[PDB]
Amino acid sequence: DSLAPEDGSHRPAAEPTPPGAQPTAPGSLKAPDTRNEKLNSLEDVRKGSENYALTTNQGVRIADDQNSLRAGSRGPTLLEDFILREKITHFDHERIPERIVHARGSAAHGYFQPYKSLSDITKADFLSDPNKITPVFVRFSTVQGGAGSADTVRDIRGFATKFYTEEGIFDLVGHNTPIFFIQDAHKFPDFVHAVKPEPHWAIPQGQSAHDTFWDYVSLQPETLHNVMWAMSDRGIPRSYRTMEGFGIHTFRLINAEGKATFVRFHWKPLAGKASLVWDEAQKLTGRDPDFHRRELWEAIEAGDFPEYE
Amino acid sequence: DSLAPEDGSHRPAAEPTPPGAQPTAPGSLKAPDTRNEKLNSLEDVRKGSENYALTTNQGVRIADDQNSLRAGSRGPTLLEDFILREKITHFDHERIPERIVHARGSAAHGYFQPYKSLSDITKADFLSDPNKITPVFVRFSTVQGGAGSADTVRDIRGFATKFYTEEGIFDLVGHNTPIFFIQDAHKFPDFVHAVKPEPHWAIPQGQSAHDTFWDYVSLQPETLHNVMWAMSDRGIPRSYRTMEGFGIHTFRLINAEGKATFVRFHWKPLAGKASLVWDEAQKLTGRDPDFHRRELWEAIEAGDFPEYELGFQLIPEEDEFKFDFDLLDPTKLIPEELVPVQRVGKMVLNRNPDNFFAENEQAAFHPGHIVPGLDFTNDPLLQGRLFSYTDTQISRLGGPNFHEIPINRPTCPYHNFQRDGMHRMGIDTNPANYEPNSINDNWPRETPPGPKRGGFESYQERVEGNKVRERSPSFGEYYSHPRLFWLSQTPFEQRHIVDGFSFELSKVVRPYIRERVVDQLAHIDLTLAQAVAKNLGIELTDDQLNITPPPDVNGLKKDPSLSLYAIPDGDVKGRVVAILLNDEVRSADLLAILKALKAKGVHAKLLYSRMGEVTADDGTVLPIAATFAGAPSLTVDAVIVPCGNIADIADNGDANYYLMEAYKHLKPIALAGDARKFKATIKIADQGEEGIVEADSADGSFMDELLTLMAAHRVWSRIPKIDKIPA
Amino acid sequence: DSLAPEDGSHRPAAEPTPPGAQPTAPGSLKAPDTRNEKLNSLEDVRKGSENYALTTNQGVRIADDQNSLRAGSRGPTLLEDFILREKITHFDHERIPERIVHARGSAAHGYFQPYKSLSDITKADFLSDPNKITPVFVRFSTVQGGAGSADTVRDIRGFATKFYTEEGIFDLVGHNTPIFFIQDAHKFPDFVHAVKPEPHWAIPQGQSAHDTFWDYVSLQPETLHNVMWAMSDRGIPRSYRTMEGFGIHTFRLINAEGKATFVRFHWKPLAGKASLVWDEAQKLTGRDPDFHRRELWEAIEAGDFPEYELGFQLIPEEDEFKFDFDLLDPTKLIPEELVPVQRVGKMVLNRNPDNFFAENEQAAFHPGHIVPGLDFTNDPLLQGRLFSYTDTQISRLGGPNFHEIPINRPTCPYHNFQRDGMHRMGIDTNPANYEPNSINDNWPRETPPGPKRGGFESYQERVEGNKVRERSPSFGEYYSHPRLFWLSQTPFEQRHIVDGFSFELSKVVRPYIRERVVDQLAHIDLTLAQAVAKNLGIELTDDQLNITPPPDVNGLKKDPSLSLYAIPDGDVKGRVVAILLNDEVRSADLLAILKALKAKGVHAKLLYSRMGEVTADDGTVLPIAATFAGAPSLTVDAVIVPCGNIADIADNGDANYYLMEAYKHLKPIALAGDARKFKATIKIADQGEEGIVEADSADGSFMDELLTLMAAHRVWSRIPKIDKIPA
Amino acid sequence: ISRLGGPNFHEIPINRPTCPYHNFQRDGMHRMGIDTNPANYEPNSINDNWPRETPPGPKRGGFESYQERVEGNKVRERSPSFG
Ligand code: HEM
Ligand code: HEM
Ligand code: HEM
């Protein structure tokens, strides 16, 4: 019953294919041979499916998964149907709280590699050798909207990178413009509340074009610089691939002798910089709310891998 | 600081005002005199702000809310700053999980009132006297999308009503169609997972147009009936005010003498039925993703209260087996042609919440929340629902004391022996925490069943059968209800159905899925399937062309109450019109226009190519509401273009496109005097045509022709001309 | 129904009554007219019970609370029984996580009042007028065990007070010893993990007598000062009413002119200092594990309200470096001989809670919660404490709104821009949720620091140094405070300390840990080291006997304020006496005894070998409170034995054991007439012995002898004789 | 669900079955298993309906309830045999 078509057209070729030619799929069935050290350590928890029996979470095989246990064919459902309650209990608890900010985002795996040793300025092991590869996990996002909001709204974009180094995890958690709206962390909740949907009716979604945000900007002039960046075409990128990335804060690099050097971090996109125009971007939140997410998944499936300096 | 403007225009009047006139606000500040028992009992948790000092949550006044505590003004932030840490900590833990289904929703407060006593058929106290007023809390929603998804997607709608009765909470949790997709609750996680975003890449949001949804439908024919409703215009309503409401399942009404009657619940809109057309709805998800939430809120602020009539379909117990279908099967409807709806009472929604998170996000509805006078039945979809709503609320709302959050608490008394749990508010003084007890003389006490204020007792239905995991043989027919639905639509509604299926299936990547769906459609109706097939480039096989159609439903071959538009019920009050200005509007036109609209209760939005003001020909100064690009035609019900300096806007791309988009979406257009030049923009003949109102000036019949068309909602006769027109 | 007895003896009188006379009850049923601002404020949440119907949490009346809905009376339970699933669901989610430390504790309500105005030294409002009364809620606890462990273990005790002031909540979170075990908050998790049950097998409960605790102590000599306290009789208080309380750290008092003064907080008991002895405390964990919790509850129901005076040690800012110890080192005390304690106000505890879980278990105290007029210091342990108390409570009480749980709510106003979070109670009507704002004209607003009602500002301390992870060199001395504490104890207290160290060290399995600890004691005092080593069968080496003792503390060689008994202050009001009954009491004796007792406020418990009653020689009916084995000598402060038919109980094993036990534990004993014949079972000399009161009959010289020994707590001169007594 | 934090308590090491467990359940707090199956529902054609139901049998078959005979009305009542 209910099985695949005879021609095997239900499944995608495991080779690089252009956008739209085939059905998208989980990365490990789409590119079995692409590996790095983080991807391989995840093998312990990956779970397969072909050729196995359907079971409960306690490992008991299920005979009939189309019906509830009842007293007679048109009777009442019995409390003793533990298969039914396990199935519905897990569903009832699928959701976890979304991120307070940056709830809407799209991620991918990859690797990082230094061009030369940087030990004159830093003793950071991941930067000490040109032949040393570091597995990374990167997450691109919007700021304001919830996890089910649209991709191509006018907003700042997040650019978060996890480096799995040999002397610890390093997270470089940045944005796509070189400054932020405010100076002190004490004002974060005040700025975020002004930009998010208003508290009485929860409008508007994924937009700064409402009264509370401009109220706050007009009374806090420190915000004007990043407001300039947001109102420009930097606020509506064509893709996560065609935008720049920054750490914003001045950080410090320490070498082996104890000398310190101030540093600001940048990401330079090798596909170049490019943005949409507003009318296009606003209408695209309706025709395909999932455009940046789609485009990233599809570029990696086609072999047009996202690359940054 | 003292930052408000002196002139006080930062705050809206506390009186009814038209959409867009003033800034919207929390309900108790906009309409402080709109009261009910539920609203009044929330006064203990409401908090003001004006004239108070800024404090921590422990009550300590804060001197500086702009800076962290550091060692030196350019120094490190100190750990001892408890004011910063409290502030950021609360911020960091603001979110709670969203609802697993129906995450996106909009809500309001109101009241219900019975039309007469129903003591003959039920002993439920809230339906026993025409003077008993019952306060309500209602939430409207979509199904698939997250809480930040858009309002006007294609999808089923939820309609949940919490009745705060004197003998307990009664929740009627319904939907906007009379049937559901599946028969047994055991398949709910399977159906839900197929429609929701696909698990590898989490796409797509708010849409059934993807491979897994159609895969599930093509393998499970029980889904076909509700799938027909979702692909029709029923799936993209114009507003929460203009859709129907249904309980779906057969319940029981139990009277004082112990007699049981079967009942199906109905909500009838008093503003009538109306929907959008697909390209408008989809575009509208980008230009204003909060269009339904916004319209609901603004309708209440302006006084256009959503009103609905509660109705009952009643079936005597002896008629259980008289139909072609099973009454306990939720994939089947009860045709109004066979069993009429009895109009029993009315609900009015008249006040918005104060705080969305606290009242809307935290509200909890559950179909298992019934009262003496009502009872359940063996419908297997309903049966598994009783388990789920209590279970899910434990992690969404954090524990078993969710009934203590202010919006959920009953207004009647509640006492029992349950104790403790996370977030416990009530402090019990009862010396005993069990029964039977002699230490508190067994209080609180059980209460026998009776005609009024008695204890809950289940209807003693007979059960006889073996313990089986099996579907009833009477549940095994999937095609005649869908066909009954198809034949009751008007011709233009049939066309929208065809286009919904074609569009959606065009997004399915694996072609064999499209073919199997089409096959399933050929078992319902051949014309339907031939039409969908041609848009997908598929040919029907000779065998598919000879499939025998399913039977009539108890002799019916059509039921007009299943169509949105067969029997018109339009009501123009609360609709909104776009008026496109120019720099020298003929003020005689404008006054005939605005006074006719106010007489019918229709709102106007004055549009221009820039914000600010415009000066009319007699020197009158008009405030502009929004630009042409800022309030697209998608948002209004009809377009009027008045006489004046037409050359101001004859060449503006946005003004012209405004008329082409409305024209495409079948809305009525009115052109006064030289505004008639615009006919060439939409290829209108000199002769004119139905749907285009035109005159020398905006006077008499001009407005009356315009308002007649508005009552008919859209101009269905223009369908044939829109396939050309690049809009 | 009416399961209660005719006579109404299932309910206690709402008037002060002696321990064991009536059933105990929720505070507001027992003492309804004992009010305070916090206690009246909780009336919005109290729930009654009598005369109400039994319902679901939704308000639906239950008819049968004895059965599940089943298909047939011997059939399967039905999923549609929502009544059963709600009752079982609330029960399934009743528990919340216990506190990570101090999980076992007992609390009560009360009030604080100052003795005079303290405006010269602080601007704290609650200390500004002798007529300003401040509601308080105090919790007493242990440290190591879980919520179900026993009360009279050997451990430090917690003393936490929440002040509901008019300028915010102020929490004073202290202990019952003047110093703590460690110097920097970074070692807290290491220290707590070492004293708690070991991780493989989770043994032992409520005890420090195990290898890991002693391993950590022997490798970290900063802990030795608090260890001397714990090994002393300070570790086993007789009651929460008879132990001292301390804040431990040095805080700042900030006056209105902006001047800063260093302060250490103290709590002095009005009932005096008293402790048990180790064998008695230990046996009491098995005979009555709820001993301290019970006696505090009953003391309050009898009107023996626990009373404490608040005391300040004040040191001007210019004297920060006058002592030869660092003022910021929390392992260092400030001897009252150097800086006396100023008595400054009093606290009274006069009302028990209504519900243990709602009020005691959900209460949240945090040292970071201070008010204008107070400020912190750089003590590294206090500094890290500020992070932890808010953090822990996010998970223990479920979210960032724990301040909205009724016992935690401030009594003063709290307004800010924080919103949402799990179980949000407050419904904000403010149109703004940020600042600066203009739409609500910037309310609520910041408030400048001032003399009264102003915003919080931190004292502008000068900070100078590099970012480093290093201990200050001035914190590097670990032996002179332990040595000044040793030398300030009386001789019997010094013997109790030696037996404390010996009993615990004998439970350490690895012998090398025993030796290392002993090596450390040699650096404090040789006599002490030699004594513990004699009991562990360890010999001191050559090297150990010549170790130079540590220096004195600022010229001091001893401070009598560190001893529990050097300077008497014991009070007998609220103590308890067991009276051993025989089948024919000489009424003459009883009466003399009960009336002498009642004049000093001493309670009595009448014990026999069975329950029910016995009659005196004059026919007076004496009801029995407990049996000899059921209310052991461990639970009373002294034992009295009247004349009558002594033959009746003279051969009763338990009645004889009662005397030997109380005799072993240094408690006063009184025997009139033929009761003197019991001297043979505890082998007393012929002339007499101090501590044994005897006479021909219960006269007044007889009770003054008994009441006088009782004011001295225990009979210290008997220690020598109890070696050769088998009990 | 509250004691152990969510619906994945069977992934806590001590609670894990040593035999195989495959199904269409997904997500929830602290999800350990990373499912590669393209389908998360059944029936499905995209993964050829795996994992699949197994009919009852003498060994290694699916679970089926004994077909006990049930008869009587819906009552909240104690059996007289229990008294
Ligand atoms: C230069 C300024 C900032 C930048 C560039 C930034 C960037 C980001 C990014 C990229 C994320 C998303 C990470 C992900 O993909 O999971 C994020 C999340 C977050 N941000 Fe920041 N942020 C900034 C300021 C702040 C401040 C000032 C605060 C609080 C004081 C804050 C609190 C948070 C929190 C609580 C999250 C959610 C983390 C989670 O749930 O895992 N951010 N931020
Ligand atoms: C006749 C079929 C059904 C209808 C009309 C229906 C209707 C609704 C509506 C309107 C809501 C949203 C309530 C709100 O506004 O907060 C909802 C939520 C929900 N439904 Fe149903 N539903 C149906 C079937 C089911 C089934 C079969 C199950 C599971 C066995 C289910 C489980 C849930 C859950 C878990 C929620 C979320 C509740 C909460 O988080 O408080 N539903 N349903
Ligand atoms: C001078 C040293 C300390 C004293 C006098 C002290 C005192 C107390 C007291 C009396 C309580 C119980 C309050 C109640 O009854 O609920 C408590 C709880 C607690 N303490 Fe401290 N403590 C000290 C050191 C620390 C340190 C250094 C830390 C961590 C850095 C810490 C963390 C905690 C935590 C997490 C709780 C549980 C709080 C709750 O769950 O509400 N304590 N402490």
* H or E, element range at C533: helix C526-536
The reply to whether residue A78 touches residue C80, judged by beta carbons under 8 angstroms, is: no
Closest listed residue to residue B61, CA positions, set A188, C450, A186: C450
d(CA C685, CA C218): 46
Cβ of B88 closer than 6 Å to ligand 1, yes or no, is yes
Q: Which residue of D has its CA nearest to B378?
A: D74
Cβ of A103 closer than 6 Å to ligand 1, yes or no, is no
d(CA B146, CA B143): 9
d(CA C57, CA C64): 16
DSSP character for C123? -
Q: Which amino acid is at C4?
A: A
Helix, strand or coil, per DSSP, at residue C105: strand
Q: Which residue of A has its CA nearest to D29?
A: A96
Return the beta strands (E) in C534-619 as ranges. 576-580, 603-608, 613-615
What backbone torsions phi and psi does residue D10 show, to the nearest 5 degrees?
-70, -10
DSSP character for B275? B
For the record, the structure tokens of C139 come out as 């919790």
The reply to whether residue C427 touches residue B403, judged by beta carbons under 8 angstroms, is: no
d(CA A75, CA B472): 9
Is B147 part of the contact surface with chain C (CB cutoff 8 Å)?
Answer: no
Contacts of D72 in chain C (CB under 8 A): 70-75
Whether the Cβ atoms of residue B691 and residue B665 lie closer than 8 Å to each other: no
Q: Could you give the residue ranges of the DSSP H alpha helices within C31-70? A: 37-41
The reply to whether residue A199 touches residue C78, judged by beta carbons under 8 angstroms, is: no
Burial of C173 (0-12, 13-18, 19+ CB in 10 A): buried
For the record, the structure tokens of C116 come out as 């005079």
Helix, strand or coil, per DSSP, at residue B237: strand
Cβ of C709 closer than 6 Å to ligand 3, yes or no, is no
Minimum-distance ligand 3 atom for the alpha carbon of C364: 41
d(CA B704, CA B701): 5
d(CA B566, CA B290): 30
Closest listed residue to residue B154, CA positions, set B239, B248, B278, B244: B278
Cβ of B402 closer than 6 Å to ligand 2, yes or no, is no
Whether the Cβ atoms of residue C149 and residue C102 lie closer than 8 Å to each other: no
Q: Which residue of C has its CA nearest to A220?
A: C436
- Cis ω before C436 (30° cut-off from 0): yes
- Which of A100, A143, A173 is the pocket-test mutation for ligand 1 (most atoms within 8 Å of CB)? A173
Q: In the sheet where B626-627 sits, what is the strand order?
A: B626-627, B603-608, B576-580, B638-641, B669-672, B692-695
Contacts of D74 in chain C (CB under 8 A): 69-71, 78
Residue bearing the CA closest to ligand 3, atom 42: C385
Cβ of B187 closer than 6 Å to ligand 2, yes or no, is no
For the record, the structure tokens of A72 come out as 């007679």
Whether the Cβ atoms of residue A80 and residue C77 lie closer than 8 Å to each other: yes
Is B612 part of the contact surface with chain D (CB cutoff 8 Å)?
Answer: no
Cβ of C217 closer than 6 Å to ligand 3, yes or no, is no
User: What pairing do the DSSP bridges indicate for beta strands C603-608 and C626-627?
Assistant: parallel
Contacts of B284 in chain A (CB under 8 A): 286
Subunits in contact with chain B (3 or more CB pairs closer than 8 Å): A, C, D
Distance C101 CA to ligand 3 centre (A): 7
Min Cα separation D13/chain B (Å): 23
How far lies B212's CA from each of A23, A103, B698, C323, in Å? 11, 25, 54, 78
Distance B167 CA to ligand 2 centre (A): 24
- The answer for B 416-445 residues in CB contact with A (under 8 A) is none
The reply to whether residue C70 touches residue D76, judged by beta carbons under 8 angstroms, is: yes
What backbone torsions phi and psi does residue C296 show, to the nearest 5 degrees?
-65, -45
The reply to whether residue A74 touches residue B383, judged by beta carbons under 8 angstroms, is: no
Burial of C685 (0-12, 13-18, 19+ CB in 10 A): exposed
Helix, strand or coil, per DSSP, at residue A159: strand
Per-residue burial over A254-263, b = 16 or more CB atoms within 10 Å of its CB, e = otherwise:
eeeeeeeeee
For the record, the structure tokens of C87 come out as 């009752």
Helix, strand or coil, per DSSP, at residue A260: strand
d(CA C457, CA C375): 9
Sign of CA dihedral C129, C130, C133, C135: positive
d(CA B651, CA B648): 8
Contacts of A89 in chain B (CB under 8 A): 391
Sign of CA dihedral A99, A103, A107, A112: negative
Whether the Cβ atoms of residue B528 and residue B499 lie closer than 8 Å to each other: no
What backbone torsions phi and psi does residue B353 show, to the nearest 5 degrees?
-70, 175
What backbone torsions phi and psi does residue A302 show, to the nearest 5 degrees?
-80, -15
Is A225 part of the contact surface with chain B (CB cutoff 8 Å)?
Answer: no
Nearest-10 Cα torsion for A193, A197, A199, A201: 180
Subunits in contact with chain A (3 or more CB pairs closer than 8 Å): B, C, D
Q: Number of A:B CB contacts under 8 A?
A: 257
Contacts of B414 in chain C (CB under 8 A): 55-59
Q: Could you give the residue ranges of the DSSP H alpha helices within B147-290? A: 188-195, 211-219, 224-231, 278-287
Is D39 part of the contact surface with chain B (CB cutoff 8 Å)?
Answer: yes
User: What pairing do the DSSP bridges indicate for beta strands D69-75 and B462-468?
Assistant: antiparallel
The length of chain C, given as a count of residues: 727
Cβ of B175 closer than 6 Å to ligand 2, yes or no, is yes
Resolution value (Å, 1 decimal): 2.3
Contacts of B511 in chain D (CB under 8 A): none
Ligand nearest to the CA of B157: 2
The length of chain B, given as a count of residues: 727
Distance A290 CA to ligand 1 centre (A): 22
Contacts of A199 in chain B (CB under 8 A): 26, 355-357
Sign of CA dihedral C680, C681, C684, C685: positive
DSSP string, B488-521: HS-HHHHHHHHHHHHHHHHT-SSHHHHHHHHHHH
Whether the Cβ atoms of residue B344 and residue B311 lie closer than 8 Å to each other: yes
The reply to whether residue D71 touches residue C73, judged by beta carbons under 8 angstroms, is: no
d(CA C343, CA C559): 19
Whether the Cβ atoms of residue D28 and residue A28 lie closer than 8 Å to each other: no
Contacts of D75 in chain C (CB under 8 A): 67, 69-70, 72-73
Min Cα separation C61/chain A (Å): 23
The reply to whether residue A69 touches residue D70, judged by beta carbons under 8 angstroms, is: no
Residues linked to residue C175 through DSSP beta bridges, in sequence order? C158, C246
Delineate the domains of chain B, giving CATH numbers in brackets: 25-410 (2.40.180.10), 470-573 (1.20.1370.20), 574-727 (3.40.50.880)
Q: Which residue of B has its CA nearest to D24?
A: B190
Minimum-distance ligand 2 atom for the alpha carbon of B385: 30
What backbone torsions phi and psi does residue C225 show, to the nearest 5 degrees?
-60, -50
For the record, the structure tokens of C80 come out as 């549609």
Whether the Cβ atoms of residue A162 and residue A138 lie closer than 8 Å to each other: yes
Distance C158 CA to ligand 1 centre (A): 39
Q: Which amino acid is at C375?
A: D
- Which of C100, C106, C385, C396 is the pocket-test mutation for ligand 3 (most atoms within 8 Å of CB)? C385
Min Cα separation C442/chain A (Å): 11
The single residue listed with the structure tokens 């705080």 is B355
Q: How was this structure determined?
A: X-ray
Min Cα separation A148/chain D (Å): 16
Minimum-distance ligand 3 atom for the alpha carbon of C158: 10
Q: Number of C:D CB contacts under 8 A?
A: 46
Residue bearing the CA closest to ligand 2, atom 20: B101
Minimum-distance ligand 3 atom for the alpha carbon of C99: 40
How far lies B444's CA from each of B434, B437, C1, C14, C401, in Å? 10, 10, 11, 22, 31
User: What pairing do the DSSP bridges indicate for beta strands B260-269 and B307-316?
Assistant: antiparallel
For the record, the structure tokens of B480 come out as 């005649």
Minimum-distance ligand 2 atom for the alpha carbon of B363: 16
- Which of C99, C229, C328, C391 is the pocket-test mutation for ligand 3 (most atoms within 8 Å of CB)? C99
The reply to whether residue B64 touches residue C446, judged by beta carbons under 8 angstroms, is: yes
For the record, the structure tokens of A237 come out as 């990128």
d(CA B425, CA C424): 12
Residue bearing the CA closest to ligand 3, atom 34: C389
Whether the Cβ atoms of residue B401 and residue B427 lie closer than 8 Å to each other: no
d(CA C613, CA B69): 70
